[PDB]
Write a protein that binds this ligand. Structure first.
Ligand SMILES: Nc1c(Cl)cc(S(N)(=O)=O)cc1Cl
Ligand SMILES: [Zn+2]
Length: 256
């Protein structure tokens, strides 16, 4: 019954998921002075103009904006990646207050939230097969800081009222994820894992350097969500982030 609380939070996950203390766990702190520019990186390609969103879902840990991944359309390629990776969902991690909420950190700085756009390697045919492979997934990570509103986010913010509790979903078509990207695609990359159970070490992390700004009101609405199910005592969905994990035998590379 894993979660983020005292008796079920990240310090407990290793019991049911021993890979929590593995060799390539995420997230990590990005030490900007130890990251090295890698000229072997090729241009990053984020091709989301044919993306088809379908639904949004409160899964009791975050909320997922789900996409139609039955065909080739919204894909991530280039950069550190070999081949083609298809967009399946995005979600966020956020805090109780603006000084925390991100998973990755930058020189130990915690941002207010972190967006994860999740893609799977089409050479493995389905998501399920891809998460049995050391290069099965690519997650594009984008930090959120609080200041001006992100217009492209507001459609998400306004449907959250309709999925307050665990297991609730709503139709969510025609959402364009290009509206959540910053201007620059400068990034850091490293091999890692899912940041929640089952913590599978199947992910190429691509973390953009440029945060997007969202408004206080927008993130305040994220914090109105619930971890609990309908009719249960209210546990606000906040601080659904895993702290930074040991880097071990890894190097973080810069695209810039
Ligand atoms: N299933 C799943 C889990 Cl458990 C974690 C992540 S994450 N947060 O992007 O690493 C992404 C997915 Cl798709
Ligand atoms: Zn995530």
């Amino acid at each position: 019954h894993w979660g983020y609380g005292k008796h079920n939070g990240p310090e407990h996950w290793h019991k049911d998921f021993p890979i929590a203390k593995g060799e390539r766990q995420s997230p990590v702190d990005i030490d900007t002075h130890t990251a090295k520019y890698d000229p072997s990186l090729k241009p990053l390609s984020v091709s989301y103009d044919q993306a088809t969103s379908l639904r949004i879902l409160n899964n009791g840990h975050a909320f997922n904006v789900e996409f139609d991944d039955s065909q080739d359309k919204a894909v991530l390629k280039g950069g550190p990646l070999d081949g083609t990776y298809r967009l399946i969902q995005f979600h966020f991690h956020w805090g109780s207050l603006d000084g925390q909420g991100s998973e990755h950190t930058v020189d130990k700085k915690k941002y207010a939230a972190e967006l994860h756009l999740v893609h799977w390697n089409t050479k493995y045919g389905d998501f399920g097969k891809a998460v049995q492979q050391p290069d099965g997934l690519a997650v594009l990570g984008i930090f959120l800081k609080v200041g001006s509103a992100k217009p492209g986010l507001q459609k998400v913010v306004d449907v959250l009222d309709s999925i307050k509790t665990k297991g609730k979903s709503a139709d969510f078509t025609n959402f364009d994820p290009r509206g959540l990207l910053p201007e620059s695609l400068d990034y850091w990359t490293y091999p890692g894992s899912l940041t929640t159970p089952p913590l599978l070490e199947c992910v190429t992390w691509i973390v953009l350097k440029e945060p997007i700004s969202v408004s206080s009101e927008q993130v305040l609405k994220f914090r109105k969500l619930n971890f609990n199910g309908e009719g249960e005592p209210e546990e606000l969905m906040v601080d659904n982030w895993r702290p930074a994990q040991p880097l071990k035998n890894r190097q973080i590379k810069a695209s810039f």
